Design an enzyme around this catalytic site. Structure first.
Site, PDB file in Angstrom:
ATOM      1  N   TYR A   1       0.833  -1.198   0.000  1.00  0.00           N
ATOM      2  CA  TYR A   1       0.000   0.000   0.000  1.00  0.00           C
ATOM      3  C   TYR A   1       0.876   1.259   0.000  1.00  0.00           C
ATOM      4  O   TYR A   1       1.926   1.295   0.638  1.00  0.00           O
ATOM      5  CB  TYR A   1      -0.896   0.012   1.240  1.00  0.00           C
TER       6      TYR A   1
ATOM      7  N   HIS B   1      -1.584   1.009  -3.364  1.00  0.00           N
ATOM      8  CA  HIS B   1      -1.465   0.431  -4.695  1.00  0.00           C
ATOM      9  C   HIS B   1      -2.632   0.890  -5.567  1.00  0.00           C
ATOM     10  O   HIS B   1      -3.688   1.278  -5.059  1.00  0.00           O
ATOM     11  CB  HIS B   1      -1.414  -1.096  -4.617  1.00  0.00           C
TER      12      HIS B   1
ATOM     13  N   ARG C   1     -11.022   1.218   3.545  1.00  0.00           N
ATOM     14  CA  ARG C   1     -10.042   1.865   2.662  1.00  0.00           C
ATOM     15  C   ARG C   1     -10.490   3.278   2.204  1.00  0.00           C
ATOM     16  O   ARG C   1     -11.683   3.548   2.153  1.00  0.00           O
ATOM     17  CB  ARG C   1      -9.854   1.023   1.393  1.00  0.00           C
TER      18      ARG C   1
ATOM     19  N   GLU D   1      -5.582   2.649  -3.544  1.00  0.00           N
ATOM     20  CA  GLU D   1      -6.200   2.066  -2.347  1.00  0.00           C
ATOM     21  C   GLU D   1      -5.291   2.209  -1.127  1.00  0.00           C
ATOM     22  O   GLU D   1      -4.122   1.815  -1.166  1.00  0.00           O
ATOM     23  CB  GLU D   1      -6.500   0.577  -2.573  1.00  0.00           C
TER      24      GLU D   1
ATOM     25  N   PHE E   1     -16.006  -4.861  -2.639  1.00  0.00           N
ATOM     26  CA  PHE E   1     -16.138  -3.750  -1.702  1.00  0.00           C
ATOM     27  C   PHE E   1     -17.577  -3.223  -1.761  1.00  0.00           C
ATOM     28  O   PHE E   1     -18.312  -3.492  -2.702  1.00  0.00           O
ATOM     29  CB  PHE E   1     -15.232  -2.576  -2.122  1.00  0.00           C
TER      30      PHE E   1
ATOM     31  N   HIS F   1     -14.586  -3.777   2.926  1.00  0.00           N
ATOM     32  CA  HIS F   1     -14.828  -5.173   2.560  1.00  0.00           C
ATOM     33  C   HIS F   1     -15.960  -5.725   3.415  1.00  0.00           C
ATOM     34  O   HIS F   1     -16.581  -6.726   3.073  1.00  0.00           O
ATOM     35  CB  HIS F   1     -13.573  -6.033   2.768  1.00  0.00           C
TER      36      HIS F   1
HETATM   37  N1  2GP Z   1     -11.197  -6.101  -4.863  1.00  0.00           N
HETATM   38  C1  2GP Z   1     -10.414  -5.381  -5.699  1.00  0.00           C
HETATM   39  N2  2GP Z   1      -9.092  -5.521  -5.692  1.00  0.00           N
HETATM   40  C2  2GP Z   1      -8.441  -4.578  -6.462  1.00  0.00           C
HETATM   41  C3  2GP Z   1      -8.981  -3.563  -7.203  1.00  0.00           C
HETATM   42  N3  2GP Z   1      -8.012  -2.783  -7.868  1.00  0.00           N
HETATM   43  C4  2GP Z   1      -6.914  -3.361  -7.505  1.00  0.00           C
HETATM   44  N4  2GP Z   1      -7.072  -4.465  -6.651  1.00  0.00           N
HETATM   45  C5  2GP Z   1      -5.929  -5.270  -6.155  1.00  0.00           C
HETATM   46  O1  2GP Z   1      -4.712  -4.916  -6.843  1.00  0.00           O
HETATM   47  C6  2GP Z   1      -4.284  -5.951  -7.807  1.00  0.00           C
HETATM   48  C7  2GP Z   1      -3.976  -5.310  -9.196  1.00  0.00           C
HETATM   49  O2  2GP Z   1      -5.072  -4.892  -9.950  1.00  0.00           O
HETATM   50  C8  2GP Z   1      -5.488  -6.947  -7.854  1.00  0.00           C
HETATM   51  O3  2GP Z   1      -5.111  -8.255  -8.163  1.00  0.00           O
HETATM   52  C9  2GP Z   1      -6.132  -6.814  -6.425  1.00  0.00           C
HETATM   53  O4  2GP Z   1      -5.388  -7.635  -5.541  1.00  0.00           O
HETATM   54  P1  2GP Z   1      -5.920  -8.063  -4.037  1.00  0.00           P
HETATM   55  O5  2GP Z   1      -7.165  -8.832  -4.107  1.00  0.00           O
HETATM   56  O6  2GP Z   1      -4.720  -8.793  -3.663  1.00  0.00           O
HETATM   57  O7  2GP Z   1      -6.101  -6.860  -3.163  1.00  0.00           O
HETATM   58  C10 2GP Z   1     -10.421  -3.445  -7.197  1.00  0.00           C
HETATM   59  O8  2GP Z   1     -11.081  -2.624  -7.786  1.00  0.00           O
HETATM   60  N5  2GP Z   1     -11.082  -4.411  -6.412  1.00  0.00           N
HETATM   61 CA    CA Z   2      -7.139  -5.810  -1.239  1.00  0.00          CA
END
Ligand code: 2GP
Ligand code: CA
Length: 104
Positions: free
Chosen positions: A38, A40, A77, A58, A100, A92
């Site tokens: 983070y 990310h 978040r 995020e 989310f 979440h």
């Molecule tokens: N749930 C979710 N995870 C996201 C999103 N954008 C980025 N991520 C996280 O960032 C990575 C790259 O796009 C994804 O594989 C996801 O990993 P995680 O589930 O590990 O958090 C989003 O819109 N929703």
């Molecule tokens: Ca996540």
């Protein structure tokens, strides 16, 4: 009371600003903390209707009031963009799978 309610966690606009500042600072220096690196990029898979422009990032906001520094993220978040604008606050908690729901 509560400008944002994620599940049962109640956050004021001040908690959100503080969390955002910490997240943005790391983003502009190119640094990250925590196993999930983070802050990310947030792809917004669910198509939330954010009014501010992308890209989005995020960053965890903790209910204990502390600024995230690498421990367990929790479910809440703050999403912000490169313009250092708040896109929204999501969680979440109450969502199924790896999705989310917006905090109310
Ligand atoms: N749930 C979710 N995870 C996201 C999103 N954008 C980025 N991520 C996280 O960032 C990575 C790259 O796009 C994804 O594989 C996801 O990993 P995680 O589930 O590990 O958090 C989003 O819109 N929703
Ligand atoms: Ca996540």
């Amino acid at each position: 009371a509560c400008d944002y309610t994620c599940g049962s966690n109640c956050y004021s606009s001040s908690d959100v600003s503080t969390a955002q500042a910490a997240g943005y600072k790391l983003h502009e220096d190119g640094e990250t903390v925590g196993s999930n690196s983070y802050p990310h990029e947030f792809r917004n898979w669910q198509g939330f209707d954010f009014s501010v422009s992308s890209p989005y990032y995020e960053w965890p906001i903790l209910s204990s009031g502390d600024v995230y520094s690498g421990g367990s993220p929790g479910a809440d978040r703050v999403v912000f963009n490169e313009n250092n604008q708040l896109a929204g606050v999501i969680t979440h908690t109450g969502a199924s799978g790896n999705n989310f729901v917006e905090c109310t």
